[PDB]
Amino acid sequence: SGAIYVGNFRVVNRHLATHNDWANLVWEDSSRDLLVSSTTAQGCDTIARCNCQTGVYYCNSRRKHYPVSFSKPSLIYVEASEYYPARYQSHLMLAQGHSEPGDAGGILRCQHGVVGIVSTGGNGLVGFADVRDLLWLD
């Protein structure tokens, strides 16, 4: 994990991308923190086709699954990190919850499938990058 595997696609946080990812680039967006690359093998995940605003995600720092309620995707100002300058991030869904450096890449699921991936966090909020608009993944 750290990645969504759907079809012949690998979806990751843009700043966690590997060299192999960029070599096999299909699509990326700085403003969303998403990168998609191609795979040879068939992936097991399905992207959720819904507007669910609750689900379960895996927290890396805690090593646990947590149920969570999150807001609808929006433009959110995000402070400078060592991965980006201060900027607006789009399609970011926010939740109250525990959040640390290294939690990016945890997958958020509902009963319909994959909803998004931890991208940001801090000030008692976990920020998830929504992937449900990416219908071409399925």
Binding site: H15, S81, Y83, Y84, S99, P101, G102, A104, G105, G121
Partner: peptide
């Protein structure tokens, strides 16, 4: 954002 994250990833640390």
């Amino acid at each position: 954002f994250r990833g640390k």
